[PDB]
Amino acid sequence: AAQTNAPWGLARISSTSPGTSTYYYDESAGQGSCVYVIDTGIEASHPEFEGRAQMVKTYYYSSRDGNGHGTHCAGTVGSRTYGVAKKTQLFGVKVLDDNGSGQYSTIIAGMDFVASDKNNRNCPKGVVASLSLGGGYSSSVNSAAARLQSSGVMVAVAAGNNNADARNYSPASEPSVCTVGASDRYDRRSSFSNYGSVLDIFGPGTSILSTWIGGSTRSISGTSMATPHVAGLAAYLMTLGKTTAASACRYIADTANKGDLSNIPFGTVNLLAYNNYQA
Protein backbone atom coordinates (compact mmCIF):
# COMPACT_ATOMS: atom_id res chain seq x y z
CA ALA A 1 0.00 0.00 0.00
CA ALA A 2 1.03 3.61 -0.60
CA GLN A 3 -0.35 6.63 1.27
CA THR A 4 0.65 9.68 -0.74
CA ASN A 5 1.28 13.04 0.94
CA ALA A 6 1.49 11.27 4.27
CA PRO A 7 2.94 12.98 7.35
CA TRP A 8 6.70 13.12 6.97
CA GLY A 9 7.06 10.74 9.91
CA LEU A 10 5.07 7.97 8.27
CA ALA A 11 6.98 8.49 5.02
CA ARG A 12 10.27 8.39 6.92
CA ILE A 13 9.63 5.03 8.61
CA SER A 14 8.95 3.44 5.20
CA SER A 15 11.95 5.15 3.56
CA THR A 16 15.68 4.53 3.43
CA SER A 17 15.95 8.30 2.90
CA PRO A 18 14.50 11.51 4.34
CA GLY A 19 12.58 14.00 2.27
CA THR A 20 9.90 11.70 0.85
CA SER A 21 6.17 12.17 1.38
CA THR A 22 4.67 8.73 0.60
CA TYR A 23 4.08 6.14 3.32
CA TYR A 24 4.53 2.57 2.07
CA TYR A 25 3.23 -0.33 4.14
CA ASP A 26 1.84 -3.83 3.81
CA GLU A 27 -1.93 -3.49 3.60
CA SER A 28 -2.31 -5.79 6.62
CA ALA A 29 -1.51 -2.51 8.39
CA GLY A 30 -1.43 -3.98 11.89
CA GLN A 31 -4.77 -5.77 11.54
CA GLY A 32 -5.20 -8.19 14.42
CA SER A 33 -2.77 -6.27 16.63
CA CYS A 34 -3.54 -3.94 19.52
CA VAL A 35 -1.80 -0.80 20.76
CA TYR A 36 -2.55 0.58 24.20
CA VAL A 37 -1.98 4.34 24.26
CA ILE A 38 -1.26 5.03 27.94
CA ASP A 39 -1.54 8.79 28.05
CA THR A 40 -4.26 11.46 28.31
CA GLY A 41 -6.94 9.26 26.73
CA ILE A 42 -8.17 8.94 23.16
CA GLU A 43 -10.94 10.84 21.46
CA ALA A 44 -12.29 7.56 20.11
CA SER A 45 -15.02 9.40 18.19
CA HIS A 46 -12.38 11.01 15.95
CA PRO A 47 -13.21 9.99 12.34
CA GLU A 48 -9.55 9.16 11.82
CA PHE A 49 -9.81 6.08 14.06
CA GLU A 50 -12.70 4.43 12.14
CA GLY A 51 -14.13 2.91 15.31
CA ARG A 52 -10.85 1.07 15.98
CA ALA A 53 -10.07 3.36 18.94
CA GLN A 54 -11.76 3.22 22.33
CA MET A 55 -11.13 4.09 25.96
CA VAL A 56 -10.63 0.99 28.12
CA LYS A 57 -9.51 2.61 31.39
CA THR A 58 -9.31 5.97 33.11
CA TYR A 59 -8.17 7.03 36.57
CA TYR A 60 -10.00 10.37 36.47
CA TYR A 61 -13.61 11.53 36.44
CA SER A 62 -13.71 11.12 32.65
CA SER A 63 -12.10 8.82 30.11
CA ARG A 64 -12.30 11.66 27.58
CA ASP A 65 -9.05 13.16 26.34
CA GLY A 66 -9.42 16.77 27.43
CA ASN A 67 -5.77 17.39 26.53
CA GLY A 68 -5.22 16.08 22.98
CA HIS A 69 -1.84 14.45 23.62
CA GLY A 70 -3.17 10.90 23.93
CA THR A 71 -5.40 11.41 20.92
CA HIS A 72 -2.34 12.68 19.04
CA CYS A 73 -0.27 9.63 19.99
CA ALA A 74 -3.13 7.25 19.20
CA GLY A 75 -3.45 8.95 15.82
CA THR A 76 0.22 8.35 15.09
CA VAL A 77 -0.15 4.70 16.09
CA GLY A 78 -3.21 3.77 14.08
CA SER A 79 -5.25 6.62 12.64
CA ARG A 80 -6.14 6.05 9.00
CA THR A 81 -4.24 9.11 7.74
CA TYR A 82 -1.64 9.81 10.45
CA GLY A 83 -1.12 6.27 11.77
CA VAL A 84 1.60 3.71 11.23
CA ALA A 85 -0.65 0.67 11.79
CA LYS A 86 -3.77 1.90 10.03
CA LYS A 87 -5.78 -1.23 10.98
CA THR A 88 -4.55 -1.87 14.51
CA GLN A 89 -6.90 -1.69 17.48
CA LEU A 90 -6.28 1.29 19.75
CA PHE A 91 -7.00 1.02 23.48
CA GLY A 92 -6.83 4.17 25.58
CA VAL A 93 -5.53 4.14 29.14
CA LYS A 94 -5.97 7.62 30.62
CA VAL A 95 -3.26 7.82 33.27
CA LEU A 96 -2.63 11.54 32.65
CA ASP A 97 -5.20 14.16 33.60
CA ASP A 98 -6.20 16.91 31.20
CA ASN A 99 -3.02 18.93 31.81
CA GLY A 100 -1.17 15.81 30.77
CA SER A 101 0.09 15.28 34.33
CA GLY A 102 -0.27 12.16 36.43
CA GLN A 103 1.00 10.66 39.66
CA TYR A 104 3.47 7.82 39.22
CA SER A 105 1.12 5.49 41.11
CA THR A 106 -1.61 6.20 38.55
CA ILE A 107 0.83 5.63 35.68
CA ILE A 108 2.07 2.40 37.30
CA ALA A 109 -1.49 1.17 37.80
CA GLY A 110 -2.22 1.93 34.15
CA MET A 111 0.74 -0.16 33.03
CA ASP A 112 -0.30 -3.03 35.29
CA PHE A 113 -3.81 -2.61 33.89
CA VAL A 114 -2.59 -3.11 30.32
CA ALA A 115 -0.62 -6.23 31.30
CA SER A 116 -3.92 -7.76 32.45
CA ASP A 117 -6.40 -6.06 30.13
CA LYS A 118 -4.74 -7.48 27.00
CA ASN A 119 -6.14 -10.85 28.09
CA ASN A 120 -9.55 -9.18 27.77
CA ARG A 121 -8.83 -8.08 24.18
CA ASN A 122 -8.59 -9.96 20.90
CA CYS A 123 -5.02 -9.32 19.72
CA PRO A 124 -3.91 -12.49 17.90
CA LYS A 125 -1.07 -10.64 16.19
CA GLY A 126 0.19 -9.17 19.47
CA VAL A 127 -0.06 -6.27 21.88
CA VAL A 128 1.85 -2.98 21.94
CA ALA A 129 1.80 -0.26 24.59
CA SER A 130 2.71 3.32 23.70
CA LEU A 131 3.88 5.34 26.72
CA SER A 132 4.22 8.96 25.58
CA LEU A 133 4.88 10.03 29.16
CA GLY A 134 7.88 10.43 31.41
CA GLY A 135 9.25 12.04 34.54
CA GLY A 136 12.22 11.74 36.86
CA TYR A 137 13.73 8.33 37.49
CA SER A 138 11.51 5.96 39.45
CA SER A 139 12.47 2.32 39.93
CA SER A 140 8.78 1.56 40.52
CA VAL A 141 7.79 3.14 37.21
CA ASN A 142 10.64 1.35 35.45
CA SER A 143 9.62 -1.97 37.02
CA ALA A 144 6.02 -1.32 35.94
CA ALA A 145 7.15 -0.87 32.33
CA ALA A 146 9.35 -3.97 32.59
CA ARG A 147 6.36 -5.91 33.93
CA LEU A 148 4.24 -4.70 31.02
CA GLN A 149 7.01 -5.75 28.63
CA SER A 150 7.46 -9.08 30.41
CA SER A 151 3.71 -9.72 30.17
CA GLY A 152 3.99 -10.06 26.39
CA VAL A 153 3.36 -6.43 25.42
CA MET A 154 5.77 -4.37 23.42
CA VAL A 155 6.35 -1.34 25.59
CA ALA A 156 7.55 1.67 23.63
CA VAL A 157 8.29 4.70 25.81
CA ALA A 158 9.41 8.25 25.13
CA ALA A 159 13.03 9.02 25.92
CA GLY A 160 11.93 12.38 27.30
CA ASN A 161 12.22 15.91 26.01
CA ASN A 162 14.99 17.15 28.30
CA ASN A 163 17.96 17.10 25.88
CA ALA A 164 19.59 14.98 28.59
CA ASP A 165 20.63 11.39 29.07
CA ALA A 166 17.43 9.39 29.43
CA ARG A 167 19.04 7.36 32.25
CA ASN A 168 17.52 9.87 34.70
CA TYR A 169 13.97 9.49 33.38
CA SER A 170 11.26 6.87 33.77
CA PRO A 171 10.04 4.74 32.18
CA ALA A 172 12.66 5.84 29.63
CA SER A 173 15.51 4.31 31.66
CA GLU A 174 13.90 0.86 31.95
CA PRO A 175 16.18 -1.29 29.75
CA SER A 176 13.69 -4.06 28.94
CA VAL A 177 11.23 -1.69 27.21
CA CYS A 178 11.88 0.22 23.98
CA THR A 179 13.03 3.77 24.68
CA VAL A 180 12.30 6.00 21.67
CA GLY A 181 14.14 9.22 20.94
CA ALA A 182 12.87 11.88 18.56
CA SER A 183 14.20 12.82 15.13
CA ASP A 184 13.14 15.61 12.78
CA ARG A 185 12.34 15.46 9.07
CA TYR A 186 15.98 16.27 8.20
CA ASP A 187 17.18 13.12 10.02
CA ARG A 188 18.53 15.23 12.87
CA ARG A 189 18.04 14.31 16.51
CA SER A 190 15.22 16.50 17.75
CA SER A 191 16.80 19.28 19.79
CA PHE A 192 14.69 18.28 22.80
CA SER A 193 15.15 14.53 22.37
CA ASN A 194 16.75 12.70 25.26
CA TYR A 195 19.65 10.42 24.38
CA GLY A 196 21.99 7.93 26.02
CA SER A 197 22.75 4.23 25.99
CA VAL A 198 19.22 3.39 27.15
CA LEU A 199 17.65 4.61 23.89
CA ASP A 200 16.87 1.73 21.55
CA ILE A 201 15.47 3.50 18.48
CA PHE A 202 14.61 6.92 17.13
CA GLY A 203 11.27 7.76 15.62
CA PRO A 204 9.90 10.85 13.90
CA GLY A 205 9.42 13.26 16.78
CA THR A 206 9.47 16.86 15.53
CA SER A 207 6.41 18.48 13.93
CA ILE A 208 4.37 15.28 13.90
CA LEU A 209 0.95 15.82 12.35
CA SER A 210 -1.68 13.59 13.94
CA THR A 211 -5.20 13.60 15.33
CA TRP A 212 -6.29 16.07 17.98
CA ILE A 213 -9.32 16.52 20.20
CA GLY A 214 -12.39 18.17 18.77
CA GLY A 215 -12.09 15.90 15.74
CA SER A 216 -9.24 18.11 14.54
CA THR A 217 -5.53 17.67 13.76
CA ARG A 218 -2.34 19.41 14.77
CA SER A 219 1.43 19.13 14.53
CA ILE A 220 3.40 18.94 17.78
CA SER A 221 6.86 17.79 18.80
CA GLY A 222 8.20 15.42 21.42
CA THR A 223 9.78 12.03 22.02
CA SER A 224 6.20 11.30 23.11
CA MET A 225 5.58 11.49 19.38
CA ALA A 226 8.39 9.40 18.14
CA THR A 227 7.03 6.75 20.52
CA PRO A 228 3.69 6.02 18.74
CA HIS A 229 5.59 5.66 15.47
CA VAL A 230 7.65 2.81 16.93
CA ALA A 231 4.60 1.48 18.76
CA GLY A 232 2.59 1.54 15.54
CA LEU A 233 5.54 0.04 13.67
CA ALA A 234 5.75 -2.86 16.10
CA ALA A 235 2.03 -3.53 15.81
CA TYR A 236 2.55 -3.41 12.04
CA LEU A 237 5.54 -5.76 12.21
CA MET A 238 3.86 -8.19 14.62
CA THR A 239 0.82 -8.50 12.34
CA LEU A 240 3.17 -9.31 9.46
CA GLY A 241 4.59 -12.04 11.69
CA LYS A 242 8.02 -10.43 11.43
CA THR A 243 8.50 -10.25 15.20
CA THR A 244 6.88 -10.72 18.61
CA ALA A 245 6.34 -8.40 21.56
CA ALA A 246 9.39 -9.71 23.42
CA SER A 247 11.54 -9.14 20.32
CA ALA A 248 9.88 -6.21 18.54
CA CYS A 249 12.23 -3.54 19.90
CA ARG A 250 15.29 -5.66 19.15
CA TYR A 251 13.83 -6.41 15.70
CA ILE A 252 13.04 -2.75 14.96
CA ALA A 253 16.60 -1.84 15.93
CA ASP A 254 18.04 -4.64 13.78
CA THR A 255 15.97 -3.50 10.80
CA ALA A 256 16.22 0.24 11.53
CA ASN A 257 17.95 2.68 9.22
CA LYS A 258 21.52 2.88 10.55
CA GLY A 259 23.85 5.85 10.88
CA ASP A 260 21.53 8.31 9.11
CA LEU A 261 20.67 10.59 12.03
CA SER A 262 22.84 13.59 12.85
CA ASN A 263 23.57 15.11 16.26
CA ILE A 264 23.33 11.66 17.83
CA PRO A 265 25.65 11.96 20.87
CA PHE A 266 28.46 9.45 21.21
CA GLY A 267 27.14 6.29 22.85
CA THR A 268 23.55 6.73 21.63
CA VAL A 269 22.22 4.39 18.96
CA ASN A 270 21.99 5.92 15.49
CA LEU A 271 18.92 3.92 14.51
CA LEU A 272 15.76 5.25 12.85
CA ALA A 273 12.56 3.19 12.88
CA TYR A 274 12.07 1.60 9.47
CA ASN A 275 9.30 -0.75 8.37
CA ASN A 276 11.53 -2.33 5.67
CA TYR A 277 8.43 -2.56 3.48
CA GLN A 278 9.29 -3.43 -0.13
CA ALA A 279 6.36 -2.52 -2.37
Side-chain angles (χ1 to χ4, degrees):
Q3 186 203 358
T4 52
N5 296 288
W8 79 264
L10 302 188
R12 189 69 195 87
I13 74 177
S14 64
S15 179
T16 52
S17 78
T20 65
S21 315
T22 309
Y23 176 37
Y24 305 110
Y25 60 98
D26 187 277
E27 64 205 1
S28 64
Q31 162 93 49
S33 72
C34 304
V35 185
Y36 287 81
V37 181
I38 312 181
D39 198 71
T40 64
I42 298 158
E43 186 172 280
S45 67
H46 198 304
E48 263 291 305
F49 296 129
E50 309 159 305
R52 291 176 293 99
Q54 60 162 297
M55 285 316 292
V56 302
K57 181 50 153 171
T58 181
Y59 298 87
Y60 306 90
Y61 59 88
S62 180
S63 79
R64 291 186 144 261
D65 182 9
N67 186 278
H69 191 281
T71 291
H72 192 278
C73 296
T76 295
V77 173
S79 69
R80 55 185 199 201
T81 286
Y82 314 101
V84 174
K86 299 176 187 299
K87 295 296 191 294
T88 193
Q89 288 293 119
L90 303 155
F91 302 128
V93 179
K94 182 170 177 62
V95 301
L96 306 179
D97 51 47
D98 286 338
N99 281 323
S101 57
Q103 306 282 132
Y104 276 145
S105 60
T106 296
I107 293 165
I108 286 157
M111 287 187 239
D112 280 318
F113 171 84
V114 171
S116 166
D117 180 90
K118 73 183 184 72
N119 300 310
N120 300 309
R121 311 298 165 182
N122 283 298
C123 315
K125 297 310 189 179
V127 183
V128 187
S130 192
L131 281 64
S132 297
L133 53 78
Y137 178 83
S138 165
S139 48
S140 56
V141 168
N142 278 14
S143 60
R147 289 198 297 279
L148 189 49
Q149 184 60 57
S150 179
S151 74
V153 178
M154 182 174 177
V155 189
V157 304
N161 303 327
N162 312 275
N163 190 37
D165 198 321
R167 51 153 74 91
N168 291 327
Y169 298 95
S170 291
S173 48
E174 175 42 56
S176 64
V177 307
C178 204
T179 302
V180 186
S183 68
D184 75 6
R185 67 178 80 244
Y186 304 101
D187 282 354
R188 300 194 303 263
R189 178 180 63 94
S190 299
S191 72
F192 51 78
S193 180
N194 276 356
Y195 46 86
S197 64
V198 67
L199 267 72
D200 305 294
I201 189 65
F202 280 81
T206 302
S207 299
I208 301 302
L209 180 63
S210 181
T211 54
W212 198 253
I213 54 171
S216 69
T217 56
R218 75 175 55 180
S219 180
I220 50 186
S221 297
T223 56
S224 290
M225 292 179 190
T227 305
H229 284 95
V230 176
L233 173 52
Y236 165 90
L237 294 175
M238 305 183 61
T239 294
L240 282 177
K242 296 281 172 63
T243 178
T244 69
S247 84
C249 186
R250 196 196 287 268
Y251 178 90
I252 285 153
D254 296 322
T255 300
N257 281 311
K258 331 283 184 74
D260 57 71
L261 297 176
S262 77
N263 190 33
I264 298 299
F266 168 82
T268 302
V269 295
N270 198 322
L271 309 173
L272 183 61
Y274 177 48
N275 72 356
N276 190 26
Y277 177 67
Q278 304 302 291

